[PDB]
Amino acid sequence: AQYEDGKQYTTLEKPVAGAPQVLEFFSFFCPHCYQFEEVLHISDNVKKKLPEGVKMTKYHVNFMGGDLGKDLTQAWAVAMALGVEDKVTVPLFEGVQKTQTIRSASDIRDVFINAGIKGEEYDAAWNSFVVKSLVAQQEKAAADVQLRGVPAMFVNGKYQLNPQGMDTSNMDVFVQQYADTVKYLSEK
């Protein structure tokens, strides 16, 4: 076939019921995740080819960057609760990987302040039980597929994208293959 299990995707041994339709995992410490966000705009190109009625979910993970990795998962929960993902994603990636100016929770906080979220509003979110549960959801989703690497994408809790089995001479071609693969799995 043109799309083959073990080539552009793999199938989970143990499917996950009730899972988000399109579920993406990343870390601000993850170098390919940086590429996926800033150079390839994967999430965006996937969305544009996804059918209507389909929601996309993106979660942060703990297993990179130790203590700061965890702070970053809580900050992404904050971002999700306030709906400010699209204003903090780039400065978080660059602060962690490019300028290396994020070294503490306070520095993560500075990124939000500079993006215009109010101190009072950020700290209230940071400490809220709504953010606690949102952190819990991020962890449980990763645990459900026993995630040990990012970037990662899962479609309907059953299929996992396999970018290693796609061509990388051309960044544009890679992205479309990736997105078309998501769509095919979507329709499966």
Side-chain angles (χ1 to χ4, degrees):
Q2 293 282 348
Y3 295 97
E4 294 167 0
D5 197 315
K7 193 213 305 196
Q8 298 102 323
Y9 68 104
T10 54
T11 304
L12 304 174
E13 279 201 15
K14 222 158 177 60
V16 170
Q21 295 163 316
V22 182
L23 177 51
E24 203 175 328
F25 291 105
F26 80 109
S27 174
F28 287 109
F29 279 97
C30 158
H32 287 138
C33 303
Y34 189 110
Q35 293 290 309
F36 267 41
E37 172 65 23
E38 290 213 8
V39 181
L40 302 179
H41 312 282
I42 294 291
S43 293
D44 200 84
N45 280 275
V46 167
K47 180 185 184 133
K48 289 190 302 84
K49 280 193 173 175
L50 292 178
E52 295 302 322
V54 74
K55 85 153 321 180
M56 292 179 74
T57 313
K58 175 133 79 198
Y59 291 159
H60 197 269
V61 298
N62 290 342
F63 60 79
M64 300 187 80
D67 204 85
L68 253 194
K70 275 210 98 173
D71 277 328
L72 280 166
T73 302
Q74 194 163 348
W76 188 247
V78 175
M80 284 187 295
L82 299 176
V84 298
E85 298 94 326
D86 297 344
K87 305 162 174 183
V88 296
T89 291
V90 167
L92 286 170
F93 265 118
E94 303 199 340
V96 180
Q97 297 185 46
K98 185 175 165 177
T99 57
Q100 285 176 7
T101 48
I102 292 177
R103 303 188 229 86
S104 64
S106 179
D107 298 337
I108 296 172
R109 180 176 186 277
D110 288 347
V111 166
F112 285 69
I113 299 299
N114 189 57
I117 295 84
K118 293 187 199 313
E120 56 179 316
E121 193 188 359
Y122 182 86
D123 304 335
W126 183 270
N127 292 289
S128 77
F129 286 86
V130 169
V131 159
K132 302 218 174 309
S133 62
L134 225 42
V135 165
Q137 293 168 228
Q138 293 184 91
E139 299 184 11
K140 172 177 182 293
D144 281 349
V145 301
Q146 200 188 309
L147 188 68
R148 94 177 71 92
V150 289
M153 186 173 304
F154 295 85
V155 179
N156 295 310
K158 250 194 96 53
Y159 306 104
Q160 180 186 348
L161 277 285
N162 183 39
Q164 283 128 263
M166 309 175 182
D167 204 343
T168 60
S169 87
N170 183 308
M171 308 193 97
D172 300 315
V173 172
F174 169 75
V175 175
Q176 293 321 320
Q177 187 175 3
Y178 198 99
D180 289 345
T181 300
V182 174
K183 178 179 193 279
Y184 157 72
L185 293 171
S186 180
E187 292 155 7
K188 206 146 185 75

